[PDB]
Write a protein that binds this ligand. Structure first.
Ligand code: PN7
Lengths: 65, 151, 150, 150, 150, 153, 151
């Protein structure tokens, strides 16, 4: 779940900590967010509506999903 | 239908000359796959420039035609054959991956687009497949497109 | 050769964009017949005018592609596939007759030209036949050309 | 009217760029004849290909300009100058016959279309005549068209 | 003193779609030139200027006057010399006293009437009118300098 | 209450010009009745360079003038009606006179051709504008234009 | 040199109107990187079709312009500015990957190409980078090409 968030946004998993917010801290694009979400649905099969999505702000908010 | 013709394509896709690069739909399975094609002829403006004395259909335009074919699958899977909403919508390339160019395409080829839905999610469509001439794969591509409001 | 691609055609005919209306020769028999085709696509500038919202390949351009094919037959029957000689000759079409338009041609069609020699004496060539889409006659015509020095 | 300018022509014919090949109508006698013309200039896309360094107006396009002229004659004979009805009909061309090319047309020519009604029987119109530059016949043709609904 | 498009091609480097002189009908060295361009609807410029209202752009009238003026300047010094023409450019420096009075439309013959106002070596000042059917549609005064193709 | 910046979709709603005679891509400053600066990007992918000239692409001087007229026309129209697309369709800006034009520097693919125009005289529907075309701060051309707004009728 | 104008580009690349999508090279380091650009203007035929009343420069043409910039980089890295050898070579692109489109490109933008060499070995070149408008990344791409003899 962390080597995934790392590889999608060209960081190193080191910076990816429950603290880090995708936009403000990892610099995720609108495009980057769309692709990250779709890549977390692929890794372990699941589905995350844009209801629930929108108010996911940091990696902690999804790691409980 | 069975086949869809240029008059139907024009009602669904917003693209116009010289960027409408699909001539006919030969197979269409909603949310699953589409087969379509574009005829390649010397009487196209692109061949003045690519290249003088050596007409070669540009690889990136093969990809564009795969994308328009996927967009036609996406429009009709979501909204059926609606000419009216089509006029308020736009297609936007998001990503392109795993592009291989294997064989040059030239005037006289029928360039066929074979695309299958890899994943779709509201207005986001991930398709992939091949482009083919005479049963041979001339290119491969995988892409994501968004249907967007023209506003 | 019997099958000529666009690179070979360009070395025989002087027509260029946007008046080169033959893409490929699939069959050629000296002094007998030729089979060739033009692919029809929406990505052609002619469809901007003929007609908005209803793209239809003009009938007179079907005839022109028949003339180009038949001229390829005449030239080839006299001098073979010789690009240097082709620079020194013009195929001048004098008459067109018995033109019938049967079915509209549209984008996505492969427009095939089937021409046979009806009569040739010296530099004078009369050819006739059909244009076909998917085994169906969409137009017919006959043509007479004289070949002269360029 | 007898004289028709391009803004009038555009309201009757569905043809647009690059297939509108009639610029002005100088005489129109219903059911009888029509005189129209197209200005030939180097600034046309067709001359890029026909031919490089030898600009010649393709004969088939002369014939298409004759056909557009005859269709204008046919339509206005039955309905006069009626843009509303014009959006309802097609002049569909069936046949072409007795075409002869006599003199090349080049940039700087005023290509005049002289068409007379040869037969009008129902919705089938048969027109024939000449194309002229400076009072000389450069081409001749007969055409058969059919007026039907759009 | 009659020059046709094949002659004009050999003197002026302009090509499609910026070659705006079809024919030179009168040429007096160091004195004047009369030339024209045919205006047809079959020109790409009318797609933009304007949709449903074809008007030949005034700046292209001036440009055709400049092209006719350059032709006169060059042939006055070197006659009809294609080979020296390849090495020269008529570079226009200033334009003055331009007046547009009558719109030019498809079907017009756009005549350029230019006279030499001043000639001193390679600096040429020409001026005159553009005309359709004996009426002045525009006026202009141009100054150019003949220089080496670089 | 006119904005100061306008983009191509705004330009399309005011000027009747279309491809290939729309020669303004973006408007960067606008002051009603006073001045306008706008620009056109010059790229090799323009049809005009097929003719002008083979192997030596050079943007035609008259098209520089034409792009300055279109900018002045945009300023004339928005000064009299604001940003009013529906009224723009009923009005044409008619070129009357051109004066005092000089070509100093050639314009080529890769240039950003800036139009700098100011009002020299405004008399009802008659507009006299004048200024320069510029590339990278250098004056590339000079011109003076008179136009008159009347009916598209 | 490090700056090349359109007449220099014409002597290296065989692409002609309407498929020459690089107007100027502003920086070039052999075997390292290239910075080039193309002006976007409404006066381009693409915009008749893509789309009516909403001109958006096609993403596949941004990629094509990145390829042309990379090809110029590859060629001049091996032979410098040599028009005579350029007549005998073609930079054939085999693969494209990892392309992303972030911001639409519209009339009036200066579309800049920023490419670096990721790997090269003889005739095999892999380049990668971004397309930029006003210092913002509007696209990114990675391309593989083989230099071959012209024919
Ligand atoms: P977010 O929902 O704001 O996503 C932004 C999208 C996916 C719309 C994208 O990042 C974007 O704004 N532009 C891509 C533009 C493009 O694809 N241009 C190529 C022309 S087909």
């Amino acid at each position: 779940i962390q080597a995934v968030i790392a590889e999608q946004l060209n960081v190193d998993a080191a910076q990816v900590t429950p603290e880090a917010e995708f936009v403000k801290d990892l610099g995720a694009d609108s495009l980057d967010v769309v692709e990250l979400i779709m890549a977390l649905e692929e890794k372990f099969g699941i589905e995350i509506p844009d209801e629930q999505a929108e108010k996911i702000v940091n990696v902690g908010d999804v790691v409980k999903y | 239908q069975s086949q869809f013709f240029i008059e139907h394509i024009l009602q669904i896709l917003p693209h116009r000359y010289p960027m409408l690069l699909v001539d006919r739909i030969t197979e269409l399975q909603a949310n699953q796959k589409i087969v379509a094609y574009k005829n390649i002829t010397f009487n196209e403006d692109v061949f003045n420039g690519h290249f003088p004395n050596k007409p070669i259909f540009p690889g990136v335009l093969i990809v564009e035609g795969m994308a328009q074919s996927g967009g036609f699958l996406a429009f009709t899977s979501l909204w059926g054959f609606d000419p009216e909403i089509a006029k308020t919508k736009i297609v936007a390339f998001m990503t392109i991956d795993k592009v291989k160019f294997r064989i040059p395409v030239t005037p006289g080829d029928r360039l066929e687009y074979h695309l299958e839905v890899l994943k779709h999610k509201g207005m986001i469509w991930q398709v992939g497949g091949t482009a083919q001439v005479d049963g041979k794969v001339v290119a491969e591509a995988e892409l994501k497109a968004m249907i967007a409001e023209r506003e």
